Amino acid sequence: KQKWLPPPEATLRESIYTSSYPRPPAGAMSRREHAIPVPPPRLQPVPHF
Amino acid sequence: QKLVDINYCKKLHVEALQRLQNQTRDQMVQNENDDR
Amino acid sequence: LSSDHRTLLKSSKRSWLQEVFLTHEDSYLNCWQAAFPHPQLRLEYEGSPVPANTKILITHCHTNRGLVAHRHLFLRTYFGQEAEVAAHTYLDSHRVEKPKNHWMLVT
Amino acid sequence: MREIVHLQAGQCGNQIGAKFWEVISDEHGIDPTGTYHGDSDLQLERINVYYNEATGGKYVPRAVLVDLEPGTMDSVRSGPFGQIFRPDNFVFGQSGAGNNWAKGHYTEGAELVDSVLDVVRKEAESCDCLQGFQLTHSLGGGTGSGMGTLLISKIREEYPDRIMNTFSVVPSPKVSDTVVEPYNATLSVHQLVENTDETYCIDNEALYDICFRTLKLTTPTYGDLNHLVSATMSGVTTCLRFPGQLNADLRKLAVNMVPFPRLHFFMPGFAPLTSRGSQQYRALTVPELTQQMFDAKNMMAACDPRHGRYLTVAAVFRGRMSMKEVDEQMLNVQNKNSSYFVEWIPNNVKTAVCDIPPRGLKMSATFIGNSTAIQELFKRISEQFTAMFRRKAFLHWYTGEGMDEMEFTEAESNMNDLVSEYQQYQ
Amino acid sequence: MRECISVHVGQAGVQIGNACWELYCLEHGIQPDGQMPDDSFNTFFSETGAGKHVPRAVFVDLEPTVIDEVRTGTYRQLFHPEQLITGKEDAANNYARGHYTIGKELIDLVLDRIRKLADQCTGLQGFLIFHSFGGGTGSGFTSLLMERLSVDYGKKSKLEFSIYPAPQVSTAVVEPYNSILTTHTTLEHSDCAFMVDNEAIYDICRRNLDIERPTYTNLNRLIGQIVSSITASLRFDGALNVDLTEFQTNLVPYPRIHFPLATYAPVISAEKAYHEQLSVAEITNACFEPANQMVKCDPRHGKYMACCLLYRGDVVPKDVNAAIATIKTKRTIQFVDWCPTGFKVGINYQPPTVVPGGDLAKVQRAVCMLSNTTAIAEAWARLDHKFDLMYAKRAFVHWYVGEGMEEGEFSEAREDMAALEKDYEEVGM
Numbered sequence A: 001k002q003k004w005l006p007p008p009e010a011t012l013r014e015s016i017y018t019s020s021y022p023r024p025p026a027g028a029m030s031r032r033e034h035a036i037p038v039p040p041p042r043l044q045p046v047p048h049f
Numbered sequence B: 001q002k003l004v005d006i007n008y009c010k011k012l013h014v015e016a017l018q019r020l021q022n023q024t025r026d027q028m029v030q031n032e033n034d035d036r
Numbered sequence C: 001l002s003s004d005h006r007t008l009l010k011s012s013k014r015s016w017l018q019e020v021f022l023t024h025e026d027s028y029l030n031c032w033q034a035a036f037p038h039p040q041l042r043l044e045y046e047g048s049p050v051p052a053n054t055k056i057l058i059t060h061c062h063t064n065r066g067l068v069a070h071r072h073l074f075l076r077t078y079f080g081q082e083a084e085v086a087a088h089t090y091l092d093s094h095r096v097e098k099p100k101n102h103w104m105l106v107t
Numbered sequence D: 001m002r003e004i005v006h007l008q009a010g011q012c013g014n015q016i017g018a019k020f021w022e023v024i025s026d027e028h029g030i031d032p033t034g035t036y037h038g039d040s041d042l043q044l045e046r047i048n049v050y051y052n053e054a055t056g057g058k059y060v061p062r063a064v065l066v067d068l069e070p071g072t073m074d075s076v077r078s079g080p081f082g083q084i085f086r087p088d089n090f091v092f093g094q095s096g097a098g099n100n101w102a103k104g105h106y107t108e109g110a111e112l113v114d115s116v117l118d119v120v121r122k123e124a125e126s127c128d129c130l131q132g133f134q135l136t137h138s139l140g141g142g143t144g145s146g147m148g149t150l151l152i153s154k155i156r157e158e159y160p161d162r163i164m165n166t167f168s169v170v171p172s173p174k175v176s177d178t179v180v181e182p183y184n185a186t187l188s189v190h191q192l193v194e195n196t197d198e199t200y201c202i203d204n205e206a207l208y209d210i211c212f213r214t215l216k217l218t219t220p221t222y223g224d225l226n227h228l229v230s231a232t233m234s235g236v237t238t239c240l241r242f243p244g245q246l247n248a249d250l251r252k253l254a255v256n257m258v259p260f261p262r263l264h265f266f267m268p269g270f271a272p273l274t275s276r277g278s279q280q281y282r283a284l285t286v287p288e289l290t291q292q293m294f295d296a297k298n299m300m301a302a303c304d305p306r307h308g309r310y311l312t313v314a315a316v317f318r319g320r321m322s323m324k325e326v327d328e329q330m331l332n333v334q335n336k337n338s339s340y341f342v343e344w345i346p347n348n349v350k351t352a353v354c355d356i357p358p359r360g361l362k363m364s365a366t367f368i369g370n371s372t373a374i375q376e377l378f379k380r381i382s383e384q385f386t387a388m389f390r391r392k393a394f395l396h397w398y399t400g401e402g403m404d405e406m407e408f409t410e411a412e413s414n415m416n417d418l419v420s421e422y423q424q425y426q
Numbered sequence E: 001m002r003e004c005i006s007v008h009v010g011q012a013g014v015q016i017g018n019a020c021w022e023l024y025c026l027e028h029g030i031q032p033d034g035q036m037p038d039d040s041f042n043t044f045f046s047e048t049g050a051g052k053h054v055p056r057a058v059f060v061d062l063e064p065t066v067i068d069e070v071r072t073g074t075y076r077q078l079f080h081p082e083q084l085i086t087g088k089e090d091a092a093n094n095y096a097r098g099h100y101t102i103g104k105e106l107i108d109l110v111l112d113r114i115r116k117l118a119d120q121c122t123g124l125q126g127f128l129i130f131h132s133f134g135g136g137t138g139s140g141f142t143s144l145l146m147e148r149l150s151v152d153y154g155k156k157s158k159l160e161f162s163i164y165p166a167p168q169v170s171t172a173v174v175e176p177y178n179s180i181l182t183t184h185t186t187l188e189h190s191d192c193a194f195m196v197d198n199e200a201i202y203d204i205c206r207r208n209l210d211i212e213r214p215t216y217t218n219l220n221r222l223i224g225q226i227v228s229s230i231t232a233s234l235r236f237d238g239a240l241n242v243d244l245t246e247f248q249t250n251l252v253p254y255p256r257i258h259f260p261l262a263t264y265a266p267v268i269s270a271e272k273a274y275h276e277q278l279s280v281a282e283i284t285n286a287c288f289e290p291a292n293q294m295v296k297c298d299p300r301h302g303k304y305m306a307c308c309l310l311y312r313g314d315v316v317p318k319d320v321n322a323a324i325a326t327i328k329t330k331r332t333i334q335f336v337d338w339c340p341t342g343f344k345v346g347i348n349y350q351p352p353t354v355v356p357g358g359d360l361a362k363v364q365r366a367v368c369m370l371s372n373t374t375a376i377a378e379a380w381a382r383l384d385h386k387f388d389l390m391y392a393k394r395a396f397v398h399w400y401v402g403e404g405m406e407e408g409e410f411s412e413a414r415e416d417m418a419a420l421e422k423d424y425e426e427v428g429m
C-alpha cells in the first residue's frame, strides 16, 4: 500500500545530489574513541632548521 | 510484367496505407463510442 | 477551473483540443483573464471595470488560449443536457473572434 | 555559457518552429508574454541555451525564422505564441520560389541570404560559447530546400567548428505532396552531405504510421504531428539543460555516431507512446521503454532496418532511473536480435541519464540510430529521378534559371555512389 | 603533518569526491557548514583562526553542470570556491580534446592550486588520483596532468584508483581508444594503480545486499569505503600501522607492474549482518571467494604474487593469524613460487563509521585486500581484442587526428600494450 499510493511527491523535480545527499542529523556523528589525545601536543619537528 | 510488379507494389503500398487508416480506425472510434 | 498546455496524452473527450477541467490544487494554471471582443478597442479597455451581463471573451493567462463551447458534438450525461467545453481561440477570415467564444457572467 | 542558435526555413520551417518553441516554453515555464511563472529553480538554471534576456524577466528565443513570402509568418505572428519572438527575427521576401530549387538557390534565395547572414552574426556573437546551430526545413519546398541549403553552405565557412544539425524532411516515399519534389530533394542531398555535421530524417508518413496505430487517433493534425517531432527535438538537448548522473549534449552524440563524415544519417524514435484510453493500463517501467524502440513501428524514418544493420545505436534517458535495470536491457538487446549489428565495433549502444522527467510524465527515452537503412531511402529518390530525367521532364524550370544539365548529372553520380559506399557494411 | 591531497578528475571525479568527502565529514566531527559542534582531521582538513576545516581537495571537470551542483546544494560552504575547477566545454569522449586542445587551458589553473595546497602541507605524504578512462577529462586531461606532475615533484607519491571499463557492458563506443591510450602515459607516471568495474559492483550490491535497483551513489559509497581503509592508519591509532609508502613497497615488485585489485569483505545488509556471526575468519573467507571481488575477472586462471591486508575495530592478533594459516593451505588459491611469504598486515583500532542513508550496518571487523595477480592479463586481452577488431576499419580515427594530434600514437599504444601483455607471463612464470 505504501508502494501503491504515492508519497505527496514534490520530489518529482529532484536532482539526485539533493535527494541522495541531504543534511544528516546532528547526532549521528562519529565519536572518536580511539584517537591519540591532542591535549598534549604531538611530537613534531618544532625546530624549524 | 516488370511494370506489373512495380504497379502492384505501388498500389499495395498506397492501398495498405488507406486501409490501415480509415477502415481499421474509424471502426475503432465507432466501437468505443458504441460501447460507452 | 484549470487547463494545461496541451500534451500528447491530455486531450479533450470528443474534440481533441486543449481540455478544461476542475482540480483541487492552487497554481497559476487556474487564473483567467477576460477581455473585449471588438479587437480595436481592447487596448483602450485594458483597465475599465467589467459590467455584469455583457459579452466578454475569457482567456487563460499561461496558455493565452480561450474557453469555448462546441455546439456541434454532444455529451450524453445522466441529466441528458449536452455540449462540450474546451479552450481554443477561434478567428474568422476577417480575423475577429467568432460567436463561439463569447461568454457572459450573469448575476 | 553554452547556447543553441536556432534556424528555421519556410512553411515546414515555421509550422514546426511554432510547436517546438511551444514544448520548450512549457518545459521552462514560459507564458506568451515572456515572463517566468514556474515552480522550481531547476527551471531557470540553464535557460540561456535557448532564451536570451531583456528588460525585466523577459526571455526571447535565439530563433531565426525565414521564408520568401510573409503569408506563413503572418500566421505565426498571430498565433497564441506569436508575441514571444522578437519582430526583427522573421526574414521574408516578396516573391517565393514555390517548389523549385534554383529560384531560391540563385535568383531569389541568393539575394536574400545577405540579411539572414546579418541576423546570425548579430546573434551568434551575443552568445558566449555557442555550441552550434540547428536547422529544420523540408527538402520538398523552394524556400528551405534551396536557400536553407545555401545558408548551410555559407555558415560553415565563417564558423567552421561550431555544430550543424538538421531535422530535415526527406520525401515521403509512398504518397507525395508535389510532382517535382524529387528534383528539389535530390539536389539538396548532394549539397547536404559535405556541409552538415549530423542529420536526422523526419518523414510524414513515418508520423502517420505511428499516430494511426499507436495513439489510436482519427483526427491527426499537423499540430499533433509537430508534437511528435518536437518531443524528440528537445529530447536530444536534455542534459545541457538538466543535470543527471551521466550527461551528454549535441557534440557527444555525433562523436559516437559519425564513424566517417559521409556517415551521419539517423532515424529517431520515442518511447512512451500510448493512447488516452490505453493510458492507465500499462506500468511505466524500464523494459517497456526499450521494448518499443527496437520495434519496427516507432521510427521517424519510413525505412525498416530488418533488411539492414544497426551500425551504431544511441540512447538518451529521462527520469530518475537509468542505472542498473537499463543495463540489463541494453545487455539483453545486444544478445537476442544478434544479427542486426555489424561485427567491427566493440559495442554500439551509447547512454546518457537525465534525472528530470518531461512535465506530466514519469519516464522516457529517445533514439538516434545511425543505420544502413538510409541507403534504401535515397534509392527511391534516384529510382524516380531517373524515371523523370531521361524524358527531360519539367527541365525548362531549371535551365532558364541559370542552372545546367551537368549539375543535374552530377547529383546522380554523387548519390549513386553514397549508396554504393553504405552498401558494403550490410 | 600526515596530509593526503586528493585529486579527483571528471564526472567520475565529482560524483566520487562527493561520496568520499561525505564520509570524512562524519568520520571526523565535521558539520556540513565546516565547523564542529582528537586531531585526525589534519590529514584532510586545514585550519583557520575561526575553527573552519577546508579540505585539501581538487575537483576537476570540463563540464559546468557537474560541479555547479555541488556548489549549489548541501555541502556548499565546506568547499573553497577555488578548489573546484571547471571548463567551459567538455572534451566529449575523446583523447586529443582532453589531452592537447582543451586540456591545455586547464593544465595551468590546476597547477597553481596544487602548488598552493602543497606549500601549506609540511609533511605531505603524497597525492591521490581518482579518475575514469571512459571520458575526456578523466582520460585525456588526467594523463596530461601526470605528464606535468612528474616534473614538479619527481619521486613524490602519486597513487591511481581508476574506473576501468567493464568487460561485458560499457556506456559508450569509442571508449577503448581513451582506455588504451591512457596506459601509454600512466605506465611511467603511476606509482600504484587499483582497478574497479561498475558491473562488478552492480551484482554485489544486489546479491550481497538486498538493495536492488541502485544508483551510482550506492556504488559510490563502497568505493569510498575502500579509501577509508587505505588511509586508515594515518589518522587513528593502531597495533600495527601502515602508510602511503607501504602499499607500493609490498605490491609493486616491478615498475611496469603496479596493478593491484581491491576487495571489501563484510558486504552484508543492515539486517542480514545483524543475524549472523562475523568473525575474522568469516570476513577473510569472503575476500578470497571469486564472487566478491571489485573486478570481473577470476584469479583461478591467475597467481597471487603480492598481498596486503587492512583491519578495523574488534580484531585480535591471534584470530588474524589463525585464519591466515588456513588460506595458505587451500589449493583453490595458489601463489607464484618467487614470492615466499606474500602478505602484509595492518591493524587499526577505530571501527568504521556508518553512513546515514547507506546500505551497511554497524560492524566490528573489515578487510580491504589489495592482491595483484596474473588475472589482469585477461583484462588487457579484452581491451585489445575489441581494439584491433575496430582499428582494422579505421572506424573512428578521424575524430582524433584533427584535434592538435598526429596519427602515430595509435600504432604505438597498441605496441606498448604488446610488450606489457608479454610482461605478465614472464613474471607470471
Ligand SMILES: Nc1nc2c(ncn2[C@@H]2O[C@H](COP(=O)(O)OP(=O)(O)OP(=O)(O)O)[C@@H](O)[C@H]2O)c(=O)[nH]1
Pocket: D246, D247, E009, E010, E011, E012, E013, E015, E016, E062, E063, E090, E091, E092, E093, E094, E132, E134, E135, E136, E137, E138, E139, E163, E171, E198, E216, E217, E219, E220, E223
Ligand atoms: N562507479 C562509478 N562510476 C562512475 C561514476 N561516475 C561516472 N562513472 C563511470 O564513468 C564514466 C563516465 O564518463 P565521464 O566521467 O562522464 O567522462 P568525463 O570525465 O565527464 O569527461 P567527458 O568526456 O567530457 O564526459 C562512465 O563509464 C560511467 O559509467 C561514479 O560516480 N561511480
Ligand SMILES: Nc1nc2c(ncn2[C@@H]2O[C@H](COP(=O)(O)OP(=O)(O)O)[C@@H](O)[C@H]2O)c(=O)[nH]1
Pocket: D009, D010, D011, D012, D013, D015, D016, D098, D099, D138, D140, D141, D142, D143, D144, D145, D177, D203, D204, D222, D225, D226
Ligand atoms: N511534419 C510536417 N510537415 C509539414 C508541415 N508543414 C508542411 N509540411 C509538409 O511539407 C511539404 C510542403 O512543404 P512546403 O510548403 O513546400 O515547404 P516550403 O515551401 O519550403 O516552406 C508537404 O509535404 C507537407 O506535408 C508541418 O508542420 N509538419
Ligand SMILES: [Mg+2]
Pocket: E010, E011, E061, E062, E063, E064, E066, E090
Ligand atoms: Mg563533465
